[PDB]
């Protein structure tokens, strides 16, 4: 009944001929060939002759494909047909939704699943999915989530329902894993259950069930043909990106854009990786024609904002991230870009606003950024609350370890600080990051060493510091002060000279200098 799908009632089941057989084969092929004048004319004739509900259903298909939803509904709701046929009830309900009749949709479907194997998706499941589509449009988000999970519980093949839960961030990271774990993959195939489960794991978050995810990608990888799959590849690059392995990510992403140019799912990851890789030209190339090709997509205006980032036109980048997030308020990557552009230009509350709206979408990353922002504001309790929430998520990001280090440092836990900075430098070696920004971690390590009176370690790290970024007055001042401590006024002097030449007004440099003078 509603356990079956659309395949049960396909004309091709005849294979398991009358005039009404011929007409059905004919209308069916006309529909698959999208010759709709033809399918409507044959579909009308067969229906007139038989009055068969399955003929009514297929006739409404063509009206649906035509965009004639009002007409499909009318034909299906006129003769109690929605009551004689699960497929009709589904299709009528499908039309009411397309028509925005939310209340009438629920009248066919019922507010709860009323029903609680042919190769298709159980119509019971599809109706649960539609039921969720309605509650979403009634903004009843609690019961949409719930009525979507019903769908997947009923037939694991209801990927539309799954796609809603995930791409609409309707669940926790754990909520999602918990769900694709408890599915009845026998509604796909008892044997080979594993195949479908692995496929679904490719969509879940990369950093909570690293064991199941690894066993999943491994099994899929052995299946010939799937190495060329975008979903598999896209998953691999998400993992890679979490590990800061940006060249690797970029090797994959790029392969995706050549072998399947029309999928735009890849861009936020490709754009983000190029920003870190500092490819202004690729970012100019890619955005320009994105604006030229897809002016309507939020993705393209994210690409434009990001270009203005590796070029430090912050007022402009803020302008196009603003545009990109007003187009699609649900587009996470754009609120991050937005937020960052405030951070850069010193506006804390606005960045924190954008950050916390960005966190709702999506991950250790937003909590990390919120954390970095309160630290700049000097709110150490809040900074720590966030960094900790971010560390519980993922403990292996060198940027997060730097921030924990700087918090430990600000509460004077020097030994824990040093531990954090040292691990941050371990992790960084394993990455494919640009190295000039990590000069800050080297200097941080030197500052912790300075505070524990261990001055020879401080000199080494501080020096490893400006090595990575040579145009830096503060580390010269840093180094100078460590020399005064080592009672070597002369080397402190040469270093204070270098930093005073770099920043001639420096108040601390100047005072610190007079004192070294012997």
């Amino acid at each position: 009944n509603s356990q079956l799908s659309t395949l049960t009632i396909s004309p091709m089941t005849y294979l398991a001929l009358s005039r009404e057989d011929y007409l059905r084969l004919w209308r069916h092929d006309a529909l698959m060939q999208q010759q709709y004048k033809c399918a409507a004319f044959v579909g009308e004739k067969v229906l007139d002759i038989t009055g068969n509900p399955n003929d009514a259903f297929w006739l409404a298909q063509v009206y649906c494909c035509t965009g004639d939803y009002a007409r499909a509904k009318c034909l299906l709701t006129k003769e109690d047909l929605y009551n004689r046929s699960s497929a009709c009830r589904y299709l009528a309900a499908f039309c009411l939704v397309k028509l925005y009749d939310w209340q009438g949709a629920l009248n066919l479907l019922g507010e709860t699943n009323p029903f609680r194997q042919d190769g298709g998706i159980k119509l019971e499941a599809s109706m649960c999915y539609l039921r969720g589509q309605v509650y979403t449009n009634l903004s009843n988000f609690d019961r949409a989530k719930e009525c979507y999970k019903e769908a997947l519980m009923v037939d694991a093949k209801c990927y539309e329902a799954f796609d809603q839960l995930v791409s609409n961030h309707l669940l926790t990271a754990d909520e999602e894993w918990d769900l694709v774990l408890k599915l009845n993959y026998s509604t796909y195939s008892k044997e080979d259950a594993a195949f479908l489960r692995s496929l679904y794991m490719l969509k879940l978050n990369k950093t909570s069930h690293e064991d199941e995810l690894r066993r999943a990608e491994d099994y899929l990888s052995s299946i010939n043909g799937l190495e060329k799959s975008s979903d598999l590849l896209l998953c691999k690059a998400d993992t890679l990106f979490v590990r800061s392995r940006f060249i690797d990510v970029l090797a994959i992403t790029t392969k995706i854009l050549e072998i399947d140019p029309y999928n735009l799912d890849v861009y936020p990851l490709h754009l983000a990786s190029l920003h870190e890789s500092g490819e202004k030209n690729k970012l100019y190339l890619i955005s320009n024609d994105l604006v030229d090709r897809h002016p309507e997509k939020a993705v393209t205006w994210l690409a434009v904002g990001i270009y203005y980032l590796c070029v430090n036109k912050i007022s402009e980048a803020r302008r196009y991230f603003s545009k990109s997030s007003t187009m699609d308020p649900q587009f996470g990557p754009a609120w991050i870009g937005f937020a960052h552009s405030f951070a850069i230009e010193g506006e804390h509350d606005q960045a924190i606003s954008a950050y916390t709206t960005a966190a709702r979408l999506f991950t250790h990353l937003p909590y990390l950024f919120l954390g970095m922002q309160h630290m700049q504001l000097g709110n150490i309790l809040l900074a720590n609350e966030y960094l900790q929430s971010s560390y519980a998520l993922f403990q292996y990001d060198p940027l997060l370890l730097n921030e924990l280090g700087v918090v430990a440092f600000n509460k004077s836990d020097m030994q824990t600080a040093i531990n954090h900075f040292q691990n941050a430098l371990l992790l960084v070696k394993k990455t494919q990051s640009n190295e000039k920004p990590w000069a800050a971690t080297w200097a941080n390590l030197g500052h912790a060493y300075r505070k524990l009176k261990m001055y020879d370690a401080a000199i080494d790290a501080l020096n490893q510091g400006l090595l990575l970024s040579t145009n830096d007055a503060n580390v010269h001042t840093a180094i100078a002060l460590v020399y005064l401590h080592k009672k070597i006024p002369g080397l402190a002097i040469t270093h204070l000279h270098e930093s005073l030449a770099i920043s001639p007004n420096e108040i601390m440099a100047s005072d610190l200098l007079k004192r070294a003078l012997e």
Partner: peptide, 23 residues
Amino acid sequence: MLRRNPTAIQITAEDVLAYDEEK
């Protein structure tokens, strides 16, 4: 997601004062 750069501890007046505990 766009990342950003490691925060940098900087030298402070408290740091010069700290030194001035040369006594």
